[PDB]
DNA sequence: AAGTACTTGAGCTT
DNA sequence: AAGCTCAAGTACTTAAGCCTGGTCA
RNA sequence: GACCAGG
């Protein structure tokens, strides 16, 4: 679901480092190297906010309390 | 009496025991219960 | 390639309201739902019910020496059409708008997805009024997202607004809430007269021979039956057919003369028209002709009356109407159905008998019917339509028998014109067929009076366990060839014999017992299910130089041409190949015209057609040009080389076409076809295993069969799924190595596992013998964090005995309730607090009887702390009922516990062994602790070098920010894939072979040799704690023998014997044997009579005296009656009051209870064992 | 299917 | 005549362990 | 107890 705070191998915090990653591909025309501007030099903490499925935004559109 | 939710229409229906279950506006035949205020503890592990 | 993310996120935030994003999943489900659409439209049911005919009844006045018995009031009723309305609200209107019922309410209310099934009944009143009436015939299922569901063509927005998940595929009948499905089975080829050599034939018919000819003919409505030729040593051939589970055996010359009013010279010149007087055939045909001349008759009338008087009894035809048309009826119904015209049946049967004699003539090879060559696929909807046709035939014949009973009684009410009569008759008989269908789909017992040419009667349906998406697909794609062949133990048809290349996957087929049987279809092999129009094909054939001989003529050189079971003409074989060539070119040209600008007229040659040119050759398959045009076959696409456009072909062209598999492999003058991309060869699930062409095929097979069970995301709509056991992997992510088809099929919605920095190293010492390790810090920071959902249901409807009305209800009956746990958990309504943690011994629902008024209880019988997420008060039905069902969905949590199997994508299933601490792990010059340590000694002897390649690819992809494309067959021998990924890595900065220098953790010094660190995808498996551990200290026992029960749900004990006995009794541990096999399981103290030697004869004494001494047991059989004066000591009495004397030799021997049970049953067989003691 | 031992009838010799 | 070994032919039980799930009438 | 699953 949500971004896995505190990436697995290392201990860096990457919670806040997705909503500012997504608006780099979105509007900067950059490639996957965009995340390098975020301060991720290793490649353990880099296979986290690169290849993570944010599978919540497809799941939050299921409220039973829709009132509609 | 309790509070439930219409599965389709989503309307609080306040049904009492030994009653005809149905959505009082929808005609639907399924009701979820709603989570009330309850104090539970979970270890952060 | 690059990670499509901005497209993924934008499709997530606001689903596409235009068109379902990933179309190829729909093109994958296409077979089933298209079969069902072809049920409803394209006139499938209609043709069937029409071909049932009409069924008759009438008042019988015995012929009485007349022969023509007179009968006035004869009704022959007929079924006009069948209608399957959209599933509306429950059958009757109930004080509201009759609303549609989406499958959501099907899955929640835990009941099936039914719809009204209407019949159009017609009359004949021994006249012509033919008045009609619409009949309610119960309710039948309907395929989700079919032409009869309320979701077809609905755009994913309208789906997520309902309770299905965006890329719903549909295709499954819902029954009680467990999505059942009709597996595709494999059948013999339609209409194509094949040969058989199988030993049973001869020794069944001792004059018979293994040489036989089989043909599976099918009417236009897909109501096939099989009629085979059995050849006998004498020279005659018997024309096998099968009717109502009854074999039938008629001679071919008989039926041949019966068909057409013919001259026997026409028969011969049809059989051996050639090379006049070729000795073999011209003698065998002479022998057959004399043999039939022996006892037969001459004319068509006489023969037809012979046959009719023969068959009249078994045939369910009208008892009266005729006997000549009964003969024209048997030749209409059983002999050859796919042919409509009689003369054409005649021509084709001549072809068949010529081919069979050729088969004995050794000039034709033995066809191998157990190959995808002569094989076809029965879709789900076609079987559904055939079973519906059969249940309808039964219904008609049943009301026919009922009216016959009304005529039989004496004449209670007899006016076949009056409607009231028929409404009464309909009232009497069972008028529900829908429930028969629903029972079929629930279990699968195809119970029909005739098997419809399907060998096994059972197993047609399988639950669609949505456990993980790959399993969902591989349910929809797969096939299975039947348990009849399964039970046979042979290295036969379970072999992957190669005429399947691109038809049915070679790699993926499960391990274990069914290995080799169920072959999942290839990635692109469709199943063409919508037939076409092909009359223009005979037109164009006869226009193309081939003409059928009206005058009986036949030569040597000429061969045969047949359009899926019809003699069209004859041709010289070189012309045959030229005809095939020009026809195929016409097919491709007009199709590629139909796609683009050019308007669409009726297609001359339908693309699906596979022109079956069978070349001639010595000792070869018999050559007959085969122009097949039917559905229920397999068809796969390729690119045509002389043109540059698509072309599709079926399982005849493979064996005779030079299909080049690489654009650079093409050799001119031979290669007529080029494969799109050999990726198109494998299946779906097998395709998405990167570098699938570097592994030893057993390992790709393991990884295929075991990826179908990943604990992955079973979708996204989980709030509205009442399935029994669902698994959700809290934090899954996209593979860094992914074959581009993995994005095209849109799996990214449905990830399966995570990406672990796997350092190949043997350092911990724990990770040997195929196990592995798991870096504890990663295990606690959220590695594969499983969540199980167990939705258990409670139904007061069943537990009421009978008689008195609805009694029990949920809640707290007026009266007190316990405080200690009840009021803690259960809210007030007997429904538990939402989200309160439950421990095994604790209630989940509270219901009370009205009579006793005392609340009952049911506790959480699971033995592991579970939570509660949602409780659903399943309303009963249309309305006006009490809450008679609850559905509680318990959310068990399961972190990776030691034993929870993990697996890379190449077959390396392991165990998380020790969860090694994070600081005691190795580490590199950069600082990343490798999260999961795999073992080096596991890569040889398994040949999973593909995994090392995957490691390279992952460490390359993660660095730069690429998504390394790893489809099979891309990287050739000139430049290795290793070299390309290594160039990438040395660009990034790390070593070029993939190595990296790692210092150990507990000593601090470097490892002398470098170590391997990659980025693999570890799709976690599903076997952790439920399966694993059962302990039995003391517990429940067996009613009969007091041995512990066979449980794990009833604390059942583990079995120890019949080889465990040999183990110890080799060890020489008689005491251990006597201990385990006797002492711990079933121990007892039983008394025996030493005098008589019987164990049943012991009875403990009753009413000896006051309290006094203890009951001293005695023996009845050795005791004599109490008549006479005897001393007070030895006497004793009986519960009924009898006194006896004798039977005092009762000692106390240990004896396993099972021997007591054996004594009981044995003496029930009247024989008793007399055991001595000394 | 595999294969076992089982049992009955038809042909040859005193 | 009929005694008596010879022949194919008719009845007839087994096909590894476990273990765990599920659905079913 | 029977049919599909699974190690
Ligand atoms: Zn890290
Ligand atoms: Zn409602
Ligand atoms: Zn005795």
From Swiss-Prot, chain A:
SUPFAM superfamilies from the xrefs?
Answer: RNA polymerase subunit RPB10
Where located? Nucleus
Q: Which Pfam families match?
A: RNA_pol_N (PF01194)
For this chain, one GO molecular function annotation is: DNA-directed RNA polymerase activity
UniProt cross-references to InterPro entries, sorted A to Z: RNA_pol_su_RPB10, RNA_pol_suN_Zn-BS, RPABC5/Rpb10
Which residue ranges traverse the bilayer?
Answer: none
On the tree of life, the source organism's domain of life is: Eukaryota
This protein's GO cellular component annotations are:
cytosol; nucleolus; nucleus; RNA polymerase I complex; RNA polymerase II, core complex; RNA polymerase II, holoenzyme; RNA polymerase III complex
- Keyword Metal-binding assigned to the entry: answer is yes
Ordered alphabetically, the record's keywords are:
DNA-directed RNA polymerase, Metal-binding, Nucleus, Transcription, Zinc
Q: Which residues bind Zn(2+) per the record?
A: 7, 10, 44-45
Q: Keyword Metal-binding on this protein?
A: yes
Query: Which one GO biological process term can you cite for this protein?
Result: tRNA transcription by RNA polymerase III
* PANTHER family registered for this protein in UniProt: DNA-DIRECTED RNA POLYMERASES I, II, AND III SUBUNIT RPABC5, DNA-DIRECTED RNA POLYMERASES I, II, AND III SUBUNIT RPABC5 FAMILY MEMBER
The Swiss-Prot or TrEMBL record describes its family as follows: Belongs to the archaeal Rpo10/eukaryotic RPB10 RNA polymerase subunit family.
- State the protein's purpose: DNA-dependent RNA polymerase catalyzes the transcription of DNA into RNA using the four ribonucleoside triphosphates as substrates. Common component of RNA polymerases I, II and III which synthesize ribosomal RNA precursors, mRNA precursors and many functional non-coding RNAs, and a small RNAs, such as 5S rRNA and tRNAs, respectively. Pol II is the central component of the basal RNA polymerase II transcription machinery. Pols are composed of mobile elements that move relative to each other. In Pol II, RBP10 is part of the core element with the central large cleft.
Q: Which HAMAP family match?
A: RNApol_arch_Rpo10
Q: Which NCBIfam families match?
A: PRK04016.1
What is the protein's quaternary organization? Component of the RNA polymerase I (Pol I), RNA polymerase II (Pol II) and RNA polymerase III (Pol III) complexes consisting of 14, 12 and 17 subunits, respectively.
Q: What is this protein called?
A: DNA-directed RNA polymerases I, II, and III subunit RPABC5
| Organism name | Schizosaccharomyces pombe (strain 972 / ATCC 24843)
From Swiss-Prot, chain B:
Explain the purpose of this protein: DNA-dependent RNA polymerase catalyzes the transcription of DNA into RNA using the four ribonucleoside triphosphates as substrates. Common component of RNA polymerases I, II and III which synthesize ribosomal RNA precursors, mRNA precursors and many functional non-coding RNAs, and a small RNAs, such as 5S rRNA and tRNAs, respectively.
Localization recorded for this chain is:
Nucleus
Kindly list the positions annotated as binding Zn(2+). 6, 9, 23, 26
Q: What is this protein called?
A: DNA-directed RNA polymerases I, II, and III subunit RPABC4
GO biological process: any one? transcription by RNA polymerase II
Superkingdom in the source lineage = Eukaryota
GO MF term set? DNA binding; DNA-directed RNA polymerase activity; zinc ion binding
Positions of C4-type zinc fingers: 6-26
Q: Which residues of the full protein are shown?
A: 19 to 63 of 63
Q: Name one GO cellular component term.
A: nucleus
UniProt entry keywords in alphabetical sequence: DNA-directed RNA polymerase, Metal-binding, Nucleus, Transcription, Zinc, Zinc-finger
Disulfide pairings: none
Kindly indicate whether the keyword ATP-binding belongs to this entry: no
* Record text on subunit structure and interactions: Component of the RNA polymerase I (Pol I), RNA polymerase II (Pol II) and RNA polymerase III (Pol III) complexes consisting of 14, 12 and 17 subunits, respectively.
Question: Mainly resides where?
Answer: nucleus
Q: Which family does it belong to?
A: Belongs to the archaeal Rpo12/eukaryotic RPC10 RNA polymerase subunit family.
UniProtKB/Swiss-Prot annotation, chain C:
Reactions it catalyzes = RNA(n) + a ribonucleoside 5'-triphosphate = RNA(n+1) + diphosphate
* Location of this chain's protein in the cell: Nucleus, Nucleolus
Q: Where are the zinc fingers (C4-type)?
A: 1089-1118
Which portions of the sequence form the region Disordered? 1-23
GO CC field:
mitochondrion; RNA polymerase I complex
The residue ranges flagged as biased composition, category Basic and acidic residues, are 1-16
Family annotation (InterPro entries): DNA-dir_RNA_pol_su2, DNA-dir_RNAP_su2_dom, DNA-dir_RNAP_su2_hyb_sf, RNA_pol_bsu_CS, RNA_pol_bsu_protrusion, RNA_pol_Rpb2_2, RNA_pol_Rpb2_2_sf, RNA_pol_Rpb2_3
> This protein's superkingdom?
Eukaryota
A GO biological process this protein is involved in? transcription elongation by RNA polymerase I
* GO MF annotations, alphabetized: DNA binding; DNA-directed RNA polymerase activity; ribonucleoside binding; zinc ion binding
Q: What class of enzyme is it?
A: transferase
Per the record, the major location class is nucleus
Asked if the Swiss-Prot or TrEMBL record annotates the protein with the keyword Zinc, the reply is yes
Q: According to the UniProt entry, what is the EC number of this protein? A: 2.7.7.6
Q: Which Pfam families match?
A: RNA_pol_Rpa2_4, RNA_pol_Rpb2_1, RNA_pol_Rpb2_2, RNA_pol_Rpb2_3, RNA_pol_Rpb2_6, RNA_pol_Rpb2_7
UniProt keyword list: DNA-directed RNA polymerase, Metal-binding, Nucleotidyltransferase, Nucleus, Transcription, Transferase, Zinc, Zinc-finger
Summarize the subunit comment: Component of the RNA polymerase I (Pol I) complex consisting of 14 subunits.
Family indicated by similarity: Belongs to the RNA polymerase beta chain family.
Q: What does this protein do?
A: DNA-dependent RNA polymerase catalyzes the transcription of DNA into RNA using the four ribonucleoside triphosphates as substrates. Second largest core component of RNA polymerase I which synthesizes ribosomal RNA precursors. Proposed to contribute to the polymerase catalytic activity and forms the polymerase active center together with the largest subunit. Pol I is composed of mobile elements and RPA2 is part of the core element with the central large cleft and probably a clamp element that moves to open and close the cleft.
- Name of the protein: Probable DNA-directed RNA polymerase I subunit RPA2
Q: Which gene encodes it?
A: rpa2
């Amino acid at each position: 679901m949500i971004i896995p705070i505190r990436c697995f191998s290392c201990g860096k915090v990457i919670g806040d480092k997705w909503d500012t990653y997504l608006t780099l591909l979105q509007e900067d025309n950059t490639e996957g190297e965009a995340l390098d501007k975020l301060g991720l030099q290793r490649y353990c903490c880099r296979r986290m906010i690169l290849t993570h499925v944010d599978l919540i935004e497809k799941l939050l559109c299921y409220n039973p309390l829709s009132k509609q | 009496t309790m509070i439930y939710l219409c599965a389709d229409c989503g309307a609080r229906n306040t049904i009492q025991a030994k009653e005809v279950i149905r959505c009082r506006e929808c005609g639907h035949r399924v009701m979820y219960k709603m989570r009330t205020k309850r104090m539970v503890q979970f270890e952060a592990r | 390639m690059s990670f499509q993310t901005l497209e993924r996120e934008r499709t997530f935030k606001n689903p596409p309201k235009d068109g379902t994003s990933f179309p190829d999943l729909q093109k994958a489900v296409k077979p089933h739902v298209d079969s069902f659409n072809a049920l409803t439209n394209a006139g499938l049911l209609n043709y069937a019910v029409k071909e049932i005919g009409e069924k008759c009844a009438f008042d019988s006045i015995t012929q009485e020496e007349g022969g023509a018995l007179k009968f006035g009031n004869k009704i022959s009723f007929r079924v006009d059409e069948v209608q399957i309305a959209k599933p509306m609200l429950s059958s009757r209107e109930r004080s509201s708008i009759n609303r549609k019922v989406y499958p959501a309410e099907a899955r929640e209310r835990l009941t099936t997805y039914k719809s009204r099934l209407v019949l159009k009944f017609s009359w004949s009143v021994n006249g012509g009024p033919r008045q009609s009436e619409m009949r309610e015939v119960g309710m039948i299922p309907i395929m989700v997202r079919s032409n009869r569901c309320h979701l077809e063509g609905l755009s994913p927005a309208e789906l997520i607004a309902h309770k299905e998940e965006s890329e719903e595929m549909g295709g499954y009948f819902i029954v009680n809430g467990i999505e059942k499905l009709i597996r595709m089975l494999i059948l013999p080829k339609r209409n194509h007269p094949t040969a058989i050599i199988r030993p049973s034939f001869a020794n069944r018919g001792t004059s018979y021979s293994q040489y036989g000819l089989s043909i599976r003919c099918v009417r236009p409505d897909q109501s096939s039956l099989t009629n085979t030729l059995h050849y006998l040593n004498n020279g005659v051939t018997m024309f096998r057919f099968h009717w109502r589970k009854n074999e039938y055996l008629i001679p071919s010359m008989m039926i041949l003369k019966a068909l057409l009013e013919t001259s026997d010279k026409e028969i011969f010149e049809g059989i051996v028209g050639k090379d006049l007087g070729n000795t073999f055939l011209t003698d065998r045909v002479e022998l057959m002709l004399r043999a039939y001349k022996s006892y037969g008759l001459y004319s068509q009338t006489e023969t037809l009356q012979y046959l009719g008087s023969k068959f009249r009894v078994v045939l369910g035809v009208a008892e009266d109407l005729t006997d000549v048309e009964v003969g024209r009826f048997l030749l209409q119904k059983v002999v050859l159905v796919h042919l409509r015209e009689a003369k054409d049946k005649f021509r084709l049967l001549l072809f068949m008998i010529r081919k069979l004699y050729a088969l004995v003539a050794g000039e034709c090879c033995a066809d191998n019917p157990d190959s995808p060559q002569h094989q076809e696929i029965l879709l789900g909807g076609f079987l559904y339509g055939q079973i519906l046709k059969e249940k309808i035939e039964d219904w008609l014949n049943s009301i026919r028998a009922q009216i016959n009973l009304d005529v039989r009684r004496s004449a209670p009410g007899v006016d076949f014109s009056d409607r009231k009569y028929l409404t009464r008759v309909f009232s009497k008989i069972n008028n529900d067929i829908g429930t028969k269908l629903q029972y079929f789909l629930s279990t699968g017992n195809l119970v029909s009076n005739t098997g419809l040419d399907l060998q096994q009667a059972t197993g047609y349906t399988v639950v669609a366990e949505k456990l993980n998406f790959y399993r969902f697909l591989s349910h929809f794609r797969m096939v299975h060839r039947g348990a009849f062949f399964a039970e046979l133990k042979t290295t036969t048809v379970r072999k992957l014999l190669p005429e399947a290349w691109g038809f049915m996957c070679p790699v993926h087929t499960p391990d274990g017992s069914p290995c080799g049987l169920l072959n999942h279809l290839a990635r692109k092999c469709e199943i063409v299910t919508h037939p076409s129009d092909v009359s223009q094909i005979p037109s164009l054939l006869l226009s193309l130089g081939v003409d059928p001989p009206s005058v009986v003529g036949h030569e040597s050189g000429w061969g045969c041409v047949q359009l899926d079971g019809k003699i069209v003409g004859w041709c010289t074989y070189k012309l045959a190949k030229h005809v095939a060539d020009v026809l195929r070119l016409m097919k491709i040209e007009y199709a590629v015209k139909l796609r683009n600008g050019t308007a669409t007229e009726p297609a001359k040659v339908p693309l699906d057609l596979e022109i079956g040119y069978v070349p001639p050759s010595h000792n070869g398959q018999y050559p007959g040009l085969y122009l097949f045009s039917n559905p229920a076959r397999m068809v796969r696409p390729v690119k045509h080389i002389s043109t540059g456009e698509l072309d599709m072909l079926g399982p005849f062209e493979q064996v005779y076409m030079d299909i080049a598999c690489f654009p650079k492999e093409i050799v001119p003058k031979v290669s007529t076809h080029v494969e799109y991309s050999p990726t198109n060869v494998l299946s779906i699930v097998a395709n998405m295993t990167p570098f699938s062409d570097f592994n030893q095929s057993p390992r790709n097979m393991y990884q295929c069969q075991m990826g179908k069970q990943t604990m992955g995301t079973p979708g996204t709509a989980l709030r509205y799924r009442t399935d029994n056991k669902l698994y959700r992997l809290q934090t899954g992510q996209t593979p860094v190595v992914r074959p581009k088809l993995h994005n095209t099929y849109g799996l990214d919605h449905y990830p399966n596992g995570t990406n672990a920095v796997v350092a190949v190293i043997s350092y911990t010492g724990y990770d040997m013998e195929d196990a592995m390790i798991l870096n504890k810090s990663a295990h606690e920071r959220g590695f594969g964090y499983g969540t199980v959902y167990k939705g258990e249901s409670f139904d007061l409807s069943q537990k009421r005995r009978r008689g008195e009305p609805v009694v029990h209800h949920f809640g707290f009956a007026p009266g007190s309730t316990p405080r200690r746990e009840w009021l803690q958990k259960l809210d007030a309504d007997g429904l538990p607090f939402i989200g309160i943690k439950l421990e095994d011994g604790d209630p989940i629902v509270a219901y009370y009887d009205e009579s006793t008024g005392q609340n009952f209880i049911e506790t959480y019988h699971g033995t592991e702390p579970g939570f509660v997420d949602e409780v659903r008060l399943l309303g009963n039905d249309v309305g006006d009922s009490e809450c008679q069902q609850i559905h509680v969905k318990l959310r068990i949590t399961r972190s990776p516990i030691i034993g929870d199997k993990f697996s890379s994508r190449h077959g390396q299933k392991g165990i998380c062994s020790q969860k090694w601490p994070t600081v005691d792990m190795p580490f590199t010059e950069s600082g990343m602790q490798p999260d999961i340590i795999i073992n080096p000694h596991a890569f040889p002897s398994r040949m999973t070098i593909g995994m090392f390649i995957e490691s390279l690819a992952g460490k390359a992809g993660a660095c730069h920010g690429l998504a390394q494309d790893s489809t099979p067959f891309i990287y050739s021998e000139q430049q290795t894939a290793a070299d390309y990924f290594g160039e990438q890595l040395v660009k990034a900065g790390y070593n070029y072979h993939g190595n990296e220098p790692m210092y150990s953790g507990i000593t601090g010094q470097e490892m002398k040799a470098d170590i391997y660190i990659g980025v693999v995808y570890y799709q976690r498996l599903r076997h952790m704690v439920s399966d694993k551990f059962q302990v039995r200290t003391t517990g429940p026992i067996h009613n009969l023998t007091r041995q512990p029960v066979k449980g794990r749900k009833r604390a059942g004990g583990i079995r120890f014997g019949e080889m465990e006995r040999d183990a110890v009794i080799g060890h020489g541990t008689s005491f251990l044997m006597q201990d385990r096999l006797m002492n711990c399981s079933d121990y007892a103290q039983s008394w025996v009579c030493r005098d008589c030697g019987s164990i049943i004869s012991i009875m403990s004494t009753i009413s000896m005296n006051g309290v006094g001494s203890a009951s001293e047991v005695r023996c009845r059989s050795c005791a004599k009656p109490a008549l006479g004066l005897e001393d007070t000591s030895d006497i004793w009495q009986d519960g009924s009051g009898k006194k006896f004397v004798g039977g005092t030799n009762t000692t106390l021997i240990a004896l396993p209870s099972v021997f007591n049970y054996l004594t009981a049953e044995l003496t029930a067989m009247n024989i008793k064992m007399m055991l001595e003691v000394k």
